[PDB]
Structures are given as structure tokens and as C-alpha cells.
Design a binder for this molecule. Structure first.
Ligand SMILES: Nc1ncnc2c1ncn2[C@@H]1O[C@H](COP(=O)(O)OP(=O)(O)O)[C@@H](O)[C@H]1O
Ligand SMILES: Nc1ncnc2c1ncn2[C@@H]1O[C@H](COP(=O)(O)OP(=O)(O)O)[C@@H](O)[C@H]1O
Lengths: 213, 213
């Protein structure tokens, strides 16, 4: 069974603001999610310095992007530190985030939406191109769990019994808006990645499906 | 919890014979599995002629090949008719198969292993390149189940609570032998496919993972 939680009020406001913004540089969501993925990977690598065993659940450190055309879904995966159930609830919704209000105020002053990451709330930039998101995570410290949101004021967390097993890490499953399906296309994804992510220490793998001739 | 079943004696013999054979044309396993996939797709299409709703669980009819290097696994998927729990138990092990003994006898006489499909036991050709296999299937008539075998005399069937949800169809998850890892390579898979599968009515999709430059 799923458990429902309430978002901290300001986060709900930020989400409403983002999913509705007519901003023109929506592609920035990928840079923010790849950046978060890279950070999660840095954390497991660092932790492993004094606890090498932590790497064994998934020895390969990578960031992987997988378009799922039929479902109009785009997945951004990492084999980073992952999030336990408590962390999902804590880190993605119930706790007040320092920059949330600050960023919204900056936005009102004329700040570029691209600044979202510098305010520490880059995760929510995903609502620029998706109206729904499932965060599937597996931390060495917990079972695999699914956190889900539709930018509304509440989210759910459910023990994962329906998705592929992740050795360790997180999958951001974005359910793209109908007018943002260009991010399912290989060429588009490739150019967005090359443009704002040249100094990423991990391999960024793009999964492409090609019909055999 | 898993349920264990005994293989019909002759099937166990055939498996032992196949997994141990030093045969030189091992690549034929792909043609046999793609052929089985095509047959499963023919069946759902035919059934849909008088029961169109059966297609809604997965409107796209395809065959998809996905190499998983890290796990040394190769998956052959189809969105065909799928198999219920009873069918997995029945069709893949417990019931005597007409050609089983006939094929082994033909083999002893000097018959080419490639004839396996004409004897109706082409599925087991997978043991030419894999020492273990998981058959994940979802029939519109049942839940998603996992059938698993290591060519031993018994197999297990478990309600699926660990793999990605299949709308409808079957996934043959082959755990490749250490000396058969060439079938994880794109070029190799492509040539094997083009050679013995030109008259397949469905798109055969190859999933490739490429690091972004
Ligand atoms: N891919 C991920 N792996 C692990 N944790 C993540 C991931 N993405 C986001 N988080 C967690 O949720 C929090 C919210 O994300 P975000 O707003 O982008 O924060 P920050 O700007 O600090 O990265 C993060 O601080 C982090 O703890
Ligand atoms: N991809 C599949 N989808 C549905 N059923 C399958 C699939 N592969 C094998 N089967 C089932 O298990 C049986 C055993 O496979 P196989 O030995 O190749 O049989 P056959 O030669 O009749 O195709 C098949 O007759 C079929 O009913």
C-alpha cells in the first residue's frame, strides 16, 4: 500500500510556479538532473573511501538516460548513493528547503529560471517538461522505494514491487508533457547534454533503440 | 515464495545434451528465440481479430533485443500473447514434448543441431550460449510470473515482484556463458539477426547504450 505525505507549502508553490511557467529555456532541466546524479555518485564514491563494501551493490558508476517513446517517459538514472524511504520523504518534500522561497522571490525580480540550481532546488526544474514524476531509489541502507508526484500538494511513497531492480542508485522517471516530447529524441537529448554538461566526471550513457535493417 | 517443479525426464536429457554440446553454430539460438517471439506475436494478433481489447495492454507489436553487459545478460523480448502461470509450468517443462526424444535420436544419427526448431523444441537452443535463464511473462489472463532454469532437472515459478512491468508479452533473460559474451556486442547481434531472420513480420529492435561524447 502507498503512504501519502504533504509537501512543505513553499515547495508546492514552487512546483505550481514551475509547471505553469512559459519560460523558453526548458532544456535546463536535464543539466540540473545530471548535476544531481553526479552529486549522488560523488557521495557513494566518497563514502566508499572508508567503506569499500558500499560499492559492491553496483560497482559501475554511471549516469544513464533512457527514452521510452511509447510511454512518453524519459528516465535519468544514476548508480549513486540512492535514497532510503526516510530520505525520500525528507529530501523531496516534507522538509523546508532554504532556497525555495529565495528562488521564487528572485524569479519575481526577473531572475532567470536557469538559476534554480544555485538556489538548491534544481530537482523541481523537471516540472518544466513533465507533469508527473516517479523517483525510484535504492540506497544500500533500505529497500527499493517509489516516490511519486504530480506537482500537487501531496506525494506518495510505496515499497517497490513493480520496477526493475536497481543495484543501487536512483531513477528519475519523467512523464513528459505532450508538447515536450522532443526530449525523447536522440539528436535533441545529445545536443542538450553536450551543451551544458562537459565537465561531468562520470560516463553519461544514452540508451537508443534501433530497428534492425 | 517460489514453487519448484520437475522437468519431464526427456527435457532434462535434451538440456544436458545442449548445454554440453561442442557444436560450432551456436548463433542459431537467436533465430529460434526470434521465431518463437514472432509466433507469440502472431497469436495475440489472431486472437485480437475477435477480441480487439486484448491489444490494449500493449498496442505495440515488436521483438526487442537488449544486451546487459555488466550482468552478462541478453534479453529477447516480445509483446506477444505471453504465458500465464499454468502455461509456463505446462509449456516449458512438466509436459512431454513430441519432438524431444525424436530430436535427440536425430542428433545421434548425425542431424545438425540447427534442426532443433523443426522438432518443436527450439526454445532449449538457448542453452547453447547460456547456463541459466529466466522467462518473465505477462499474459492478459494472469499476473506477471518468472520461470527460471539452470538446465537442471527442476525449475521454479515465482510471482514477479522484482522486474519491470511488461504490458503484455515475454522476456527471455539469458545469463550468457563466459565464453559466449560476443552476443552482447552490437555488431555481432546485428549480423546474426540479418543472416537468419529476413522474413520476420515484426520490427526487431536492438537496444544500444552509447556514452555521450
Ligand atoms: N539523483 C539523486 N540521488 C540521490 N539524492 C538526490 C538525487 N536527486 C535529488 N536528491 C536529493 O533530494 C534533494 C533535493 O534535490 P535538489 O533540489 O536538486 O537539491 P540540491 O540543489 O541540494 O541538489 C537533494 O539535496 C538530494 O539530497
Ligand atoms: N516467446 C514466447 N511467448 C509465448 N510462448 C512461448 C514463447 N516461447 C516459447 N513459448 C511456449 O513454450 C513452448 C516451448 O517452446 P518451443 O520448444 O520453442 O516450442 P515450439 O517449437 O512449438 O515453438 C511453445 O510451444 C510455446 O507455447
Amino acid at each position: 500500500a502507498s503512504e501519502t505525505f504533504e509537501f512543505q507549502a513553499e515547495i508546492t508553490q514552487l512546483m505550481s510556479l514551475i509547471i505553469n511557467t512559459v519560460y523558453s529555456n526548458k532544456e535546463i532541466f536535464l543539466r540540473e538532473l545530471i548535476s544531481n546524479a553526479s552529486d549522488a555518485l560523488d557521495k557513494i564514491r566518497y563514502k566508499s573511501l572508508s567503506d569499500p563494501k558500499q560499492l559492491e551493490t553496483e560497482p559501475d558508476l554511471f549516469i544513464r538516460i533512457t527514452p521510452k517513446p511509447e510511454q512518453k517517459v524519459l528516465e535519468i538514472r544514476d548508480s549513486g548513493i540512492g535514497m532510503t524511504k526516510a530520505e525520500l520523504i525528507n529530501n523531496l518534500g516534507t522538509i523546508a528547503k532554504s532556497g525555495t522561497k529565495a528562488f521564487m522571490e528572485a524569479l519575481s525580480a526577473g531572475a532567470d529560471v536557469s538559476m534554480i540550481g544555485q538556489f538548491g532546488v534544481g530537482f523541481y526544474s523537471l516540472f518544466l517538461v513533465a507533469d508527473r514524476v516517479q523517483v525510484i531509489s535504492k540506497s544500500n541502507d533500505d529497500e527499493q522505494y517509489i516516490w511519486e508526484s504530480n506537482a500537487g500538494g501531496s506525494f506518495t511513497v510505496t515499497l517497490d514491487e513493480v520496477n526493475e531492480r536497481i543495484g543501487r542508485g536512483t531513477i528519475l522517471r519523467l512523464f513528459l508533457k505532450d508538447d515536450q516530447l522532443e526530449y525523447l529524441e536522440e539528436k535533441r537529448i545529445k545536443e542538450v547534454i553536450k551543451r551544458h554538461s562537459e565537465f561531468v566526471a562520470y560516463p553519461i550513457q544514452l540508451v537508443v533503440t534501433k530497428e534492425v535493417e
